[PDB]
Amino acid sequence: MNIFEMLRIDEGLRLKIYKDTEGYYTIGIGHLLTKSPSLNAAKSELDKAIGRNTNGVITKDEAEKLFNQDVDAAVRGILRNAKLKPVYDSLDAVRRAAAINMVFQMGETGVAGFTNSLRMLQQKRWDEAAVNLAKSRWYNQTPNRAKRVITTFRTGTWDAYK
Numbered sequence: 001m002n003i004f005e006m007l008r009i010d011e012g013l014r015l016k017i018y019k020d021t022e023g024y025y026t027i028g029i030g031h032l033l034t035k036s037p038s039l040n041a042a043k044s045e046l047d048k049a050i051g052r053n054t055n056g057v058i059t060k061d062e063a064e065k066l067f068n069q070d071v072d073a074a075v076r077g078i079l080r081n082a083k084l085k086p087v088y089d090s091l092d093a094v095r096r097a098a099a100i101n102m103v104f105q106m107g108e109t110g111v112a113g114f115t116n117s118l119r120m121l122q123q124k125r126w127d128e129a130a131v132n133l134a135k136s137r138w139y140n141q142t143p144n145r146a147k148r149v150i151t152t153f154r155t156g157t158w159d160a161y162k
């Protein structure tokens, strides 16, 4: 297991435009296209991201290309965020993957309210962090995924992903 395999499990792979858990147009391995309710707008974003007229369909290779970009960009972002970098740097590689997973799903703005969880993670208070992480919209809306990510933070193992 690693961050790519972990997110592939959590996000799936679909080659046609679909709506994510929040109802937003998405393709590939959780590549968010836009929050616009306009399918035409999503198709434009897709064509821009891929560099050809896709008509809303891509290949597995193209999906994997966007995915690698999205994972890389999520990491680079964390490192650019003064609140997130110190916690990320304090973690082992397995828990870093859990961190990347959350930022991939919700963005840096999506984790702005996780200040108290972040402190507990920095303190390596793993069971307390795990309890705090679940007191969230995130957990309530996507509990099965959140349970996997939280177990990863709690244990520093890949047990939740087999």
Ligand SMILES: Cc1cccc(CN=[N+]=[N-])c1
Residues within 6 Å of the ligand: 078, 084, 085, 087, 088, 098, 099, 100, 102, 103, 111, 114, 117, 118, 121
């Ligand atoms: C950079 C980073 C470290 C640990 C967790 C998260 C996700 N949000 N929370 N808690 C981000």
